[PDB]
């Protein structure tokens, strides 16, 4: 035991102003200058001192009976006062500036230790904390995890951000939930040994080979967002997956996903996908991200009646009509495609967010009854009219229609042209292969506001 040598002012025990204020309330005193006894201090067994701007825990060594502490969201560096508090079983100290965790080395009763978002490199002092079942070390600067190799009760683990070598995990077969995000990992072969894994988060790494996952059939949650994946054949073994993120990879072949019918969320944004036929039987999906691929035909999507959230932006899609039966849709994004007809979207009476900039849309009238919209995008349309004949005097109908059914007057017209509703007219002295015009019109549908703008090209035949 540590003991104060006599009754002492709280503020002479706890030299931190903010910690002293807290301990005054904990210890049932009126003023931080009031004295307390060692007996009073020995009554404190838990302490929730998160989010108080504490810079020093000097004084806590005299709280001999502590079992659980929260000092998260503070400004701690030195944690030497924990050194002899061997009754500690749970420590929360995420979001500090701790570098030296040597004072933890003898706290062998610890079962939970949260240290993410600190300045830790060296984790050798954790090596004898063999009763840990939860250890979080992400958002640090750890490169070497050999000190984890003897923590064979671990169930929940994370670390970062410089690890390449995962071999120290080999014996931690009690692991259920692992986050190795934002390291330097390419080789995940050791993970095949962790057959109790239910959740694996491994975003922002250099992983290309996922064959090690093959026997990890208890996986329900897997994130490989931001890696170098292409062959995902191994995922066909993981039929318990409900939540899968493979965004930001090089995947083209989705056939291995076709049997993962427990999937409710699937992210496949920023890949090399042109064929989503393999997704047609994934009817439990509520969330599907297919942005930044090479899609044209999205007809397999019409089967996915439970979708509430769908991204399709940055593809080469002309026909949006496969979404038309997905009436639970609340948020739909398909900006940067080639959609010219949104008549099918009239069906999406539950739609709230509708994002359709950089398409070929000319007529908002099908959207007019979508009054639950709160977010809308219709900027920067562009399309080419069917050719008309070059003549000295040549007129075409304006075809740009607001949600009201009213024609939107051109903003600009090439080659000195003019507008008299409904017709755009050019006097052209000699043959030109095309003329053009722009429009730009703010519009609100429901509560969703955008600028409906675009560039229309009119080819002229010789």
């Amino acid at each position: 035991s540590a003991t104060i040598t006599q009754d002492t002012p709280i503020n002479q025990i706890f030299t931190d102003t903010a910690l002293a204020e807290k301990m005054k309330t904990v210890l049932g005193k009126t003023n931080v200058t009031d004295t307390v006894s060692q007996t009073d201090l020995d009554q404190v067994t838990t302490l929730q001192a998160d989010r108080l701007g504490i810079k020093s825990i000097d004084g806590v060594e005299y709280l001999n009976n502590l079992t659980q502490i929260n000092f998260s969201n503070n400004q701690l560096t030195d944690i030497t006062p924990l050194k002899n508090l061997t009754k500690l079983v749970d420590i929360l100290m995420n979001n500090n500036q701790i570098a030296d965790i040597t004072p933890l080395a003898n706290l062998t009763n610890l079962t939970g230790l949260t240290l993410f978002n600190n300045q830790i490199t060296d984790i050798d002092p954790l090596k004898n904390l063999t009763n840990l079942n939860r250890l979080e070390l992400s958002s640090n600067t750890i490169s070497d995890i050999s000190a984890l190799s003897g923590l064979t009760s671990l169930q929940q683990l994370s670390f970062g951000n410089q690890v390449t070598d995962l071999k120290p995990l080999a014996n931690l077969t009690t692991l259920e939930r692992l986050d190795i995000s934002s390291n330097k990992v390419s080789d995940i072969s050791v993970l095949a040994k962790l057959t109790n894994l239910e959740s694996l988060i491994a975003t922002n790494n250099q992983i290309s080979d996922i064959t090690p996952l093959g026997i990890l059939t208890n996986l329900d949650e897997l994130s490989l967002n931001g890696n170098q994946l292409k062959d995902i054949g191994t995922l066909a073994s993981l039929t318990n997956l409900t939540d899968l993120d493979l965004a930001n990879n090089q995947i083209s072949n989705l056939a291995p996903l076709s049997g993962l019918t427990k999937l409710t969320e699937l992210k496949l944004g920023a890949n090399q996908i042109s064929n989503i036929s393999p997704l047609a039987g994934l009817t439990a999906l509520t969330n599907l991200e297919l942005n930044e691929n090479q899609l044209e035909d999205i007809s397999p999507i019409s089967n996915l009646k439970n979708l509430t959230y769908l991204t399709l932006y940055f593809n080469n899609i002309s026909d949006i009509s496969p979404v038309s039966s997905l009436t639970k849709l609340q948020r739909l994004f398909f900006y940067n495609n080639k959609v010219s007809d949104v008549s099918s979207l009239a069906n999406l009476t539950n739609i709230n967010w509708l994002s359709a900039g950089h398409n070929q849309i000319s007529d908002l009238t099908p959207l007019a009854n979508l009054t639950r919209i709160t977010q809308l995008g219709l900027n920067d349309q562009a399309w080419t009219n069917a050719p008309v004949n070059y003549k000295a005097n040549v007129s075409i109908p304006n075809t740009v229609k607001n949600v009201t059914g009213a024609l939107i007057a051109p903003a600009t017209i090439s080659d000195g042209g003019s507008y008299t509703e409904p017709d755009i007219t050019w006097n052209l002295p000699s043959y030109t292969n095309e003329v053009s015009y722009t429009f730009s019109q703010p519009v609100t549908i429901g509560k969703g506001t955008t600028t409906f703008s675009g560039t229309v090209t009119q080819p002229l035949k010789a």
Binding site: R51, L92, F116, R134, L135, Q156, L178, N287, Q330
Partner: protein
Amino acid sequence: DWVIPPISSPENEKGPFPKNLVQIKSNKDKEGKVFYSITGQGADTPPVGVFIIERETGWLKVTEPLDRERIATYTLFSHAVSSNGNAVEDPMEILITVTDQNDNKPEFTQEVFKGSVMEGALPGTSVMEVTATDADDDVNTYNAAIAYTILSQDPELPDKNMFTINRNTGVISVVTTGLDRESFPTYTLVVQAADLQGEGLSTTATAVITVTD
């Protein structure tokens, strides 16, 4: 334009913390480099930093387990600011819904309920009522759906089961004959309230019944 999925999280989520919720994105990130941030209770006002965002990815994370019975929903706002320091979106309101787990046992309104009953009250006579509440979500789950039972009677005379309880309402009725004040003036019942329609978490309290002339 914002590109954000709706955000729901169960309470009492398992670690490791922090956990990824959703990616937050503006489609104006194609015109330049965007700094993302969040404001609101649970972000930049108390409790601060329950929710945080990765600066460039827009990954929104939760740093600790939630408790629906303390805060059931959070209202955050996302912000998007260019490298030159100008906002490129208006702040977007983001609702975070915390969904229920059965983590509260029923709680009796009293530890000791008192009632009385007349000798020779007819079988079927309502005597008293006991009542428990449950802090879990009675709208979307059975986590607060309480069944009432009797565990014991003291004394067990003249019969073991002098009384019954309505498993839905907690009303305690006489169901047999032979009440006798002179011999057995009082009955101490242990009553149990259990959620999940009787199958779940449970709590016990006492009902003390005085036999009157």
